[PDB]
Design a protein around this ligand. Sequence first.
Ligand SMILES: CSc1nc(-c2cccc(NC(=O)c3c(F)ccc(O)c3CN3C(=O)c4ccccc4C3=O)c2)c(-c2ccnc(NC(C)=O)c2)[nH]1
Length: 292
Amino acid sequence: ALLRILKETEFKKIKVLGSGAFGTVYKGLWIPEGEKVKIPVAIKELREAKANKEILDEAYVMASVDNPHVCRLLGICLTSTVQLIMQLMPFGCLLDYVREHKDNIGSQYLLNWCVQIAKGMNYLEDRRLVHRDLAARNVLVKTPQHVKITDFGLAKLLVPIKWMALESILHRIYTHQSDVWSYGVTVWELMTFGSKPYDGIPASEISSILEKGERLPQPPICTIDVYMIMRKCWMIDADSRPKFRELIIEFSKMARDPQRYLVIQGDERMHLPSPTDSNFYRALMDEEVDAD
Ligand SMILES: CSc1nc(-c2cccc(NC(=O)c3c(F)ccc(O)c3CN3C(=O)c4ccccc4C3=O)c2)c(-c2ccnc(NC(C)=O)c2)[nH]1
């Protein structure tokens, strides 16, 4: 009951919202049968990678996740292309969000996003779902206070070298501990307000600079405590890397004293919303950690 099979005649693509390595995302409308309302949805049309039944079996898995920081597949249509339906998130992905708010994001937001991403990843680890492509472009913003991971398993069932653990580059090994590497790069993206990692360095060179011990640089706003977390995510020995549940704890601890761990100009005037604005955001958009 968690996956709705849609017929092509009950939804329509309206405008393209983006494209990626795996398909095209549309703003769409769902038109309930026998009703006169048009409900906005998001539609992902995949590129060609599988029998329809095997695709449906993978879809039931994507539809069965249940965690506030992980997107769930809601509906699917397999008549022509593979078309995936989920709730429309008007804020888009977190990478675009942080670039758009470049030096106007407080430390409380940044650290809470790190907590939320670690929580969704930890849940995927519990379900034995390896993401393979965690990055700020695959974290969706439901509200600025609530982010959600999408597209786990998409990489497998269908190449982000600059987000991949060394063992994934050299040997195509993909585990939860290689997702931890990508988590560290995702944290780096957030802390640099969406900088491109290893900008200007060709992808084919990343393996060699990693083996020489070079890593992404310390973001200007990060205290060493935050930067050490990222460095630990990029250890060559995958079993030396942090676990997602250890990352939740560490980033949650930091979120309780955020201005001690990130150094942001004007941070004092960039706190989380008052209870009034939070209640308003939740009532309108989100009916489903603070300083001490
Ligand atoms: C990266 S860009 C991007 N994508 C999307 C998008 C749109 C619709 C659906 C999805 N994803 C899933 O349904 C899904 C998921 F929920 C969890 C895991 C997962 O693996 C998948 C994918 N997946 C597969 O690989 C796959 C293979 C075989 C069978 C079945 C499946 C299968 O379902 C994503 C957006 C987006 C979404 C909502 N609002 C906006 N708003 C603005 C302003 O942009 C953007 N942005």
